[PDB]
Structure formats: C-alpha cells, structure tokens
Design a protein around this ligand. Sequence first.
Ligand SMILES: OC[C@H]1O[C@@](CO)(O[C@H]2O[C@H](CO)[C@@H](O)[C@H](O)[C@H]2O)[C@@H](O)[C@@H]1O
Ligand SMILES: OC[C@H]1O[C@@](CO)(O[C@H]2O[C@H](CO)[C@@H](O)[C@H](O)[C@H]2O)[C@@H](O)[C@@H]1O
Ligand SMILES: OC[C@H]1O[C@@](CO)(O[C@H]2O[C@H](CO)[C@@H](O)[C@H](O)[C@H]2O)[C@@H](O)[C@@H]1O
Ligand SMILES: O=N[O-]
Ligand SMILES: O=N[O-]
Ligand SMILES: O=N[O-]
Ligand SMILES: O=N[O-]
Ligand SMILES: O=N[O-]
Ligand SMILES: O=N[O-]
Ligand SMILES: [Cu+2]
Ligand SMILES: [Cu+2]
Ligand SMILES: [Cu+2]
Ligand SMILES: [Cu+2]
Ligand SMILES: [Cu+2]
Ligand SMILES: [Cu+2]
Lengths: 334, 334, 334
Amino acid sequence: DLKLPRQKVELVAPPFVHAHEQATKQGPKIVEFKLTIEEKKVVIDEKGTTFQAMTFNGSMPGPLMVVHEGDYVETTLVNPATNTMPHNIDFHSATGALGGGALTLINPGEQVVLRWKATKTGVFVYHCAPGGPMIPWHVVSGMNGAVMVLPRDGLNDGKGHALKYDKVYYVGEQDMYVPRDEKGNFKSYDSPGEAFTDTEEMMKKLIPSHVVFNGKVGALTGKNALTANVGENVLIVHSQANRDSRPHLIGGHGDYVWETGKFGNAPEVGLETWFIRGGSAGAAMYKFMQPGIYAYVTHNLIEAADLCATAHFKVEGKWNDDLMTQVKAPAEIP
Amino acid sequence: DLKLPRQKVELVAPPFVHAHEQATKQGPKIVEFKLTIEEKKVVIDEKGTTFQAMTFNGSMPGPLMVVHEGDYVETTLVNPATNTMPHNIDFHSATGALGGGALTLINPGEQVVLRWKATKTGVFVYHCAPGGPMIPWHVVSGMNGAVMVLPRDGLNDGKGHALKYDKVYYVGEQDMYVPRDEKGNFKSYDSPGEAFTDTEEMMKKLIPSHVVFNGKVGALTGKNALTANVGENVLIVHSQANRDSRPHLIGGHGDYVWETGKFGNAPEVGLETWFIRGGSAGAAMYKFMQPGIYAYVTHNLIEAADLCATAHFKVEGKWNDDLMTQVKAPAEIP
Amino acid sequence: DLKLPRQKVELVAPPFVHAHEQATKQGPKIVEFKLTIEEKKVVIDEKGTTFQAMTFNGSMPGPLMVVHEGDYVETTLVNPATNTMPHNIDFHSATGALGGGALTLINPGEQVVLRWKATKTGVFVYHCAPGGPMIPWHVVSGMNGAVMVLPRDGLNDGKGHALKYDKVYYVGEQDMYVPRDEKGNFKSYDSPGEAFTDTEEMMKKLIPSHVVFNGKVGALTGKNALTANVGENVLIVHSQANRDSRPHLIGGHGDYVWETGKFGNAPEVGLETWFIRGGSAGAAMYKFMQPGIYAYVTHNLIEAADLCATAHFKVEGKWNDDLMTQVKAPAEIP
Ligand SMILES: OC[C@H]1O[C@@](CO)(O[C@H]2O[C@H](CO)[C@@H](O)[C@H](O)[C@H]2O)[C@@H](O)[C@@H]1O
Ligand SMILES: OC[C@H]1O[C@@](CO)(O[C@H]2O[C@H](CO)[C@@H](O)[C@H](O)[C@H]2O)[C@@H](O)[C@@H]1O
Ligand SMILES: OC[C@H]1O[C@@](CO)(O[C@H]2O[C@H](CO)[C@@H](O)[C@H](O)[C@H]2O)[C@@H](O)[C@@H]1O
Ligand SMILES: O=N[O-]
Ligand SMILES: O=N[O-]
Ligand SMILES: O=N[O-]
Ligand SMILES: O=N[O-]
Ligand SMILES: O=N[O-]
Ligand SMILES: O=N[O-]
Ligand SMILES: [Cu+2]
Ligand SMILES: [Cu+2]
Ligand SMILES: [Cu+2]
Ligand SMILES: [Cu+2]
Ligand SMILES: [Cu+2]
Ligand SMILES: [Cu+2]
C-alpha cells in the first residue's frame, strides 16, 4: 500500500560510506539495502591472533547505511546456509518490535525483509540480538554497524548556519574477548560454537583483550590511513555497540560534535575529547588546518596504544606557522 | 520557627512512585517522610545466590521521594535495634553537612530528623555514607535511592512547551559484589559483618558479579514487567549511586532526556542510549508508539543479558505498519 | 617575525594556580612558560607504597597554565641529563604536529621551544606522548597536566551574565598501576625502566591499584585541604588524561559546569555529579552556602574511599538553618 519511489543503495565497506546527498530536494522514498551475514575466522592483530567473527556483509563494523528523515528503509537480511547460527537485526533508529529484532530472526538458509520509517535523525547503532546470552555474544563477535538519518536540509550548527562535510568516514570500534590458555597465549577455535563457552566466561569479567577500529589492530593505518587536505571539513561517525569510548583527534579538535549522535540537538563546539556511550553512535566534524599525520584514538591510551584502538589520518597541504611552530629545535641545555 | 503547612507522604516501593502533582498551585510546605533501615539477607538471582543487603525501607533501590522546588523535606530516619551497624543519609539534593550525612549518624536503636530545603530541581541520589571504607560498602550493599524535585510549573522542553508524563517509574540500578569460593561458587554469609572482608577485596577490583534493577535479576519482568499503552508518555527515572550506566529502551527512544538529571537544563531530544554517571540520577521520557514487549537495559549488553540488568515493558495498543512492517516473513533464500 | 609583547609566567604547584586575569583589556601576547621534567620515586599512600613517577615540574599533575584566547603560548621543555628517558609534550589545546608532540621529542640533556596559538577556549589536557606503548606508560606514570584558555571577556553563563570566580583550584586525577608480588604486597622498583614490564602487564588489564588527586592518597586533606568561605565562588578544574572520572562535591553542587571543559559551550546548571572523559579536562564552579567540611570525590565511591580519590574543603562562615537543620538529634526510638 506504500506508493513511494524505490531507490537501491550499493553499500560499501567501512571506513568509506556509500554516496549520498546531504541536503536533498527529494521527498521520501523507500531506500533498499541488502545485508548478508558472514561468520568467519579472521586475524585481528599483527601477531596473528585469530578470532571467530560474525559480521554483516563481511566487515567489522557492518557498513554505514545513509538515508534522510522520513524515508522508509527496506532491508533484506540474508543468512546463508553456510552459517551455523540464527541471526537477526535491531536498528536503534527504528520504532517497534525490539528495533526489528522480533521480526527478523532467520535460520541459516533464510532471508527476511523489514521496513522501518526513519522518524529520528542522527547516527544510530544497528546490531544482531537473537535472544538472551546470545545478544552480547553476537554483538561482541562483530555483528554491529550504524545508520545515519540526515535532516533533508542537511546538518546545521544550531545557530542558523549550515554545516556541510567534504567527506565522511565511519569508524566502528569493537571490544573483543579472546581467551588465553594456561601459558598465556591466545586460543584459537574451529567454530563460533566452540569459542562460546570460554568467550562467555571472559566476557562476564568485562575486560576486553583487544579494542580495534575497523576489525583489526592497525586497520586504519599505512596504505589504509584516513586522508584529508588542509581546508577540508571531515565528518567522523564513531560507533560502539557494547562499551564506552572516548574519541580524540591528536593534533586536532572536534569543531562540531554530537556526542550522543542525534541531530535534533545542536552540536557542541571545540571539543578535545568526546564520549560515545556503549550502545550508540556519535559524530564529530573537523576542518583540518595543518598537514601531517594525526592519530584518531580512544583516549584511554592503554586501549589506544596497547589494545589496538588507533587510526591515522594523513593530511596534505601547507604548514601554518602562526598556529604552531618549533621556535628552537632540540638542543643541549645551556 | 518555620511556619509552613505540613504534608505527610506514604512512600511506595519501587518501581512505583508515590502520588504527586506535576505542576502545582500549592506554595512551599514541609513534606514529611520516614525511612526505616533494614539489613537483610536476600536472593538476587534465579540460581538462588544470596546477598547481605542493607536497605532504606526494605527495598533496593530505596523509594523515590517527590517534592517541588522550595519545599522543605523533613525525613525521620530510623535505625531499629534489630540492625547491627550505624547508618546515616546523604541527599545529593541538599546543601550542607555532607548532604545531611554529618547530621544523621544513628546507631541501632536510634532515630534522627533532618530537614533540608529543596533549592535544586531534578532527580538526585540519596545514599548512606557512614564514613571511610564503610561509605562504598553500605552503598553497594543497597543503601541508595533517589529524590525528584519538580519545578512548580511542572516539566518543560526548554522551548516553551510543557512536558507532562502519564506515569513515572523509578529504576534503581545496583552493582553488587558477591565473592566466589575456590571451586567458583558464590559465597553465602551469616551477617553483613562477616561478608565485609571478602566483599571489600572484591569491590576494590572494580568488577561487579551482578548488575540488577530493583534488587534482583528479573525483578522487572513477567508479572512485574513495567506497563504502558500506545500514546502514553512515560517518565523513567534511573539512578546509579556508584557506577556508570547507559540506559536504552529497545524498540524505543528517549524522546526527552535529562541525562545529568537536572531540570534547570533543557532536555536533549531523540536519543538512542543515554548515560547515567555513577553517583547520579537521570530521567527520560518516551511516548509509546507501538504495542508489544520492549526491553529496558543498560547497553553494556554483557551486563544486561549476563549480569542481570534487563527490565521489560509490556505495551498495549494497535500496531502501526507505517512505522515498521515485516514486508516478507522468513523464507528460504531463492 | 611574530612582533607581540612577551610575558613570563612563574608556574605554581597544584592545586594552586598562577596569578592571572579573568577578563582582560590586554591584547594577544606571547606567554612564556618553562617545564622541567623530573623522573623520581615517590610515596603514593599512607602505607608507604612507592611509585616510579615521571613528572612535569616535579608534581602530579603538572602545573595549570592559564592564558587567553588568541595568546601564543611559548613553552621551553627541558629534559635534564639526570633523567633516563626521552620525553615530549602534546597540548590538546594546540593545532598540528600531534599537539606539539612531533616537534618536542627531547633526549636527556636537551631542551626544545614550542609555540602554539591558543585558538580554542576551555580547559585542556597536556601530556607526554613519546610514541607507541610509551605513550600510556608516560601518562599513567604522572606526565600530564592542564592548560586553561580563557575568553578575553572572562567566563559567562550562556545567557548574557558574567561568571567571575573568587578562586580557582586544579585537581588532577591520576590512575596508577602498581604491581603486586606473589604474597600480595606492592612491588618497589629501582628505576622506571625496571618497573616497565610488570607495570605494562598490569596496565593492559585496565584496573588501577590507586586513583589519587594531586599525586597521593590524602594529598588534598588536613593541612592541605582546599579552603573557601561562605559566599565565595570557587572554580574547580578537574583533569584525567587516561581514564574517566565522575566528580562530585559532597554537600554541594556544580552551580555551573562545563563537563566537556570548553567555554564556547554554555555551562550546565545545578549538577550533582559530572563526568570527565578520559583524555580531557572539565570545570565546575560553586558558590558555597554552608560552612564546614566538604569532600570532593570521584563518585565511584570504591575509588574515592578505598583507592585514594578524595579531597576535602574546609569552609568558614555562618550556618544557614533555612537550607538545612537537624530538627531532632539522634535519640532512642519511641
Ligand atoms: O602436569 C599436570 C598438572 O598440571 C595442571 C596445571 O597445573 O594441569 C595441566 O595438566 C592437566 C593434565 O595434562 C591438563 O588437563 C590441564 O589442562 C593442564 O593445565 C594440574 O591440574 C595437573 O596436576
Ligand atoms: O588439599 C590441600 C591443598 O589445597 C589447597 C588449595 O590448593 O588449600 C585447600 O585446602 C586447605 C586445607 O584444607 C584449605 O584451608 C584451603 O582453604 C583450600 O583451598 C592448598 O593450599 C593445600 O595445600
Ligand atoms: O617453593 C617453590 C615453588 O614456589 C613457586 C610458587 O608457587 O615459585 C616460588 O619459588 C620459586 C623458586 O624460588 C620462585 O622463583 C618463584 O618466583 C616463587 O613464586 C613455584 O613455582 C615453585 O615450585
Ligand atoms: O589450556 N586451556 O585453557
Ligand atoms: O646540539 N646542541 O645544542
Ligand atoms: O573457599 N574460600 O574462599
Ligand atoms: O519457506 N520457504 O520459503
Ligand atoms: O614475586 N614476584 O612477582
Ligand atoms: O537518648 N535517647 O533518647
Ligand atoms: Cu547474529
Ligand atoms: Cu541495542
Ligand atoms: Cu548504612
Ligand atoms: Cu554521594
Ligand atoms: Cu615522558
Ligand atoms: Cu592526548
């Protein structure tokens, strides 16, 4: 009975985001997405530690879905027969039926189609939630992503001025719980099922072994560093489906920050470090002023440097000596 | 010398709240409350784990006290001779004498009467605080509740519009520290005193064994689920006297949220998950749009599903297919 | 080429703050500071536990630096030959080069001079960040402080009214990780280098042994209690470079709070407890209304009472019985 135009989106793997308009003259449409669940053993660190991951579309985090307020989001969720467990999807952006979870439980070999109306603006978590103790387990195994619901007029600063980003990145942070054997090495498992008992015991102690961006230590460094140029306004969407995080751009700021992630609220300005509550997404925009390398971290520095939670930006452009200068290089003390 | 009318309140056990007006034409009064401390061994989980609780009025949390700005709150605190320890009360809503703690220390067999002027609006924690290492121990043993100080004109959205709730619930979250014996079973103790040494050792490691609403795993489920109807605006007051929490209504939102809990500040709008700082209360209101079961959790999902921190709402009314619909039920993949 | 007047500041040890103007008619200047790194073994608790500290200017936290928006901050960082490690400095208030860290790495026997323009108002962390796993280690060893960048018109409430403080204190909170030996006693080490392996292993488990203000349990109690008088407006700057905190003034409030610490945002009003995200500074002002002793804590009460995180205020003036009174002193129950 819903007679609106249909638009398909081709999702892209994080940290990139599929093409979209900020402000739009389009009216509501039914925006069609497909997510295909993949359970797979992956490597999560430079030492070769393995992990029984469970993913939407093969990635941790799942891809960012972008729509506008008043759109209808129609998702085909697919659980191929090559998987071992039931799965579903809960959208924090949606209203009713446990976010959609109560309507989307699918066994291996099945698919389901859910539609929800995007009545709330902001960035929001989505995650699997099959029931009971499976809920945390599927989430901390990687089954979480985000969806961004933009105002049709684009973003604003709460004082009448438009805020337009030149690019957007999606940083999904994942707390992981990898058990150790008696001598202190990380364990490997043959299936998610086999990993479950030891993983749950560790989970209940509330200390992760790894905290990573984009699924692996170092994922967003080297060839895969984030990039910008001086003068570019970059939006960084950050999600954490289970545990708090405190993002910080080393050498920069959050010029405009929605730490609770919801665009009906004005952004805060000029932040050093912001806070993503476990179970949410937030967003920060920054206009780069200086070239060079920046690190984007959670500012629990133990997590950042020792447990995996560091990304880099490589920024091109001209150095601004008015903003910062080395007046005297390192020299022997007089 | 204070010549105002006196009004007695009959407190009720959480999650319910004693009857009160939102907006009022009454001027200030002296509002009289009684709290009677009870130390008691209770069951906190479905496996029969026991716990040496210490409570105001027999409940965890202690009952919600509701007054208006400019009222005077006169509390008779009673420590019956059947208890073993000294106790007191600190109101975060009050000014002076460590919140009242320095004026209310009572041995078993004694009572005291404290009056404080409600000069600050919002929801606030109250808790026992007898001195030194006893302070955390009495709090994490259950000796905490909340008090709500309403504006005399009721709540507003910060943009001129009244916000009236149809009902209010009080969810008190309790971090508990139950030691285990060598083979890994929870220990039982004959008295709070006997539980103290092992409990303190565990407390200092900062990981709870249980995180519960209303004193027990499953307290706010089944016959004791929270309830609403589609179209009802429900206020949920959430407190945590010792440790952070991140509330989330699964399948809903926080339409208007005071996460720091203080009504002199405008609410934020349209939240997915909010944050209650340890040592505070916050409040969220939501107008239900869909029938069915909702879960109200802390969105550390390990705490929610595995350590006890899940409540349910059962909501009656008509399903709204515009907001959400299952377009295609689970089916075999083509 | 920068032709502005130069002004030297004599830094003072926390919790005190060097003399400065709130509102000023001065235009921009180059404000000159010196920080001299000291590695030293210190006592951190009343039991005599020792700790391999690394400090700016000999203190934990490092001293508060105060300037105005648009000033240039020129810091001479000195690493004497008596130290063992390289060190640097990252200012969260600065733009570029990892906050200055990429321009300030100095070996023992060297110094460097960095200048940055104070373009962002608020309170901000500064900390050492030499690279890799050294970053958390130097920070949690004590190498962090703060800088306050005031508006030239002083502070305001966001509604047109000036907020002038009568005094300001700087409370730096430090999470410390002191390993234990087999029988459960804290270990002592002969050098920071020797402490590193055991300290890193503990750090990665994310539970501190101590959480202190001003470098030691009890530092801000007794002779060294903070002080005020009834009617005095006190600003409390609170920093935490690595881990979250939840400040609370027991018996008081946060009348005006910048919990994210940034003066381009209006303060929140009337808070009980606020939240300092790890990697940030925040600020709260309170006008004292009652004499007596107050405690200033993190409201994880286990951390406050058992791990070290309690300061006192001693406040002089006249008791206000309208705000609070003991109606009936402790007496036997009728
Ligand atoms: O060497 C036997 C001795 O080792 C312990 C660990 O201290 O257990 C190890 O050996 C057992 C027998 O091979 C294994 O099953 C166990 O998993 C391993 O830790 C003791 O329990 C045992 O007495
Ligand atoms: O079987 C004795 C042996 O067991 C240990 C634990 O490994 O201690 C247990 O037995 C002691 C004597 O009964 C108890 O006091 C103790 O509480 C219990 O754990 C060893 O310490 C002991 O050598
Ligand atoms: O008494 C020897 C016995 O003690 C253990 C600890 O259970 O190790 C202790 O003694 C070793 C030899 O002196 C020390 O190196 C070690 O540091 C200390 O804990 C056992 O490993 C050993 O069998
Ligand atoms: O070696 N097993 O944990
Ligand atoms: O290189 N020393 O001045
Ligand atoms: O068995 N005692 O912990
Ligand atoms: O039931 N299978 O389409
Ligand atoms: O006794 N060494 O940890
Ligand atoms: O001192 N008893 O009332
Ligand atoms: Cu799943
Ligand atoms: Cu969720
Ligand atoms: Cu008590
Ligand atoms: Cu308190
Ligand atoms: Cu250093
Ligand atoms: Cu930093």
